[PDB]
């Protein structure tokens, strides 16, 4: 922790809460409801925000690029919203249950370490493989750090983590917006962007 006393705040001029001393990556003092005033709860919520932002970055990619790239005629991905029922080689239940066990084991490993830092790091079959990362939420390893892009002294890594969390907050809002836009209108996100850019003064949410 580098207790940035004068970090830029979300609400300039107002004092940040005491449990937010800037310790966490991208801390701007935003906790009006005080949902993280407990150290254990703070830790848990740090983990939650990180995993949410990572999932949501993966989702924002997988929604916005395929339809921005099939709006232009590159290939033919259907609408991300109704992309759930367009049938595949099997039924959704077999894939969902098969994936649940697959996704489940990894989730269990994360739970094993979130609740006990650094106790699951090594591999169950070949016990010489040893995931690298020494922080919870930042596991490293050859699997999650093959390039070692951010294994340098804790300076660039701290500004690298903020980068990740900011992109991730943006992605969470993005993904929720696409779902809300798809429920309110009946179009695609790139369609909405193109329309609002064709007529900004009139083609907005105040169009119904």
């Amino acid at each position: 922790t580098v207790a940035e006393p004068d970090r830029p705040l979300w609400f300039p001029g107002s004092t940040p809460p005491p449990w937010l001393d800037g310790s966490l990556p991208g801390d701007f003092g935003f906790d009006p409801l005080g949902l993280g005033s407990d150290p254990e709860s703070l830790r848990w919520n740090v983990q939650a925000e990180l995993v949410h932002s990572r999932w949501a970055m993966l989702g924002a990619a997988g929604i916005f690029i395929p339809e921005f790239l099939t709006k232009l005629g590159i290939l033919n991905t259907p609408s991300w919203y109704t992309a759930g029922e367009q049938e595949y080689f099997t039924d959704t239940t077999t894939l969902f249950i098969v994936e649940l066990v697959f996704i489940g084991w990894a989730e269990g490993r994360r739970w094993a370490d979130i609740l006990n830092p650094g106790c699951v790091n090594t591999d169950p079959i070949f016990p010489n493989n040893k995931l690298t990362g020494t922080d919870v939420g930042y596991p490293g390893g050859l699997w999650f750090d093959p390039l070692g892009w951010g294994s340098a002294s804790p300076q660039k890594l701290k500004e690298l983590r903020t980068k990740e969390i900011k992109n991730g907050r943006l992605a969470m809002l993005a993904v929720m917006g696409a779902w809300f836009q798809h429920i309110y209108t009946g179009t695609g996100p790139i369609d909405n962007l193109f329309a609002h850019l064709a007529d900004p003064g009139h083609a907005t949410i105040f169009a119904a």
Binding site: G34, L35, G36, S37, D38, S41
Partner: protein
């Protein structure tokens, strides 16, 4: 938060949430297997 977690576990609130969950479960069960006077599986 800690105190909110405490208050949400006081006896009346704990019991109303428990009984609401139980009611939901029983309601759904009888919504799927309605008019059941016996155990017909085995």
């Amino acid at each position: 938060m800690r105190d909110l977690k405490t208050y949400l576990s006081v006896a009346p609130v704990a019991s109303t949430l428990w009984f609401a969950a139980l009611a939901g479960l029983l309601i759904e069960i009888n919504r799927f297997f309605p008019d059941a006077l016996t155990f017909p599986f085995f």
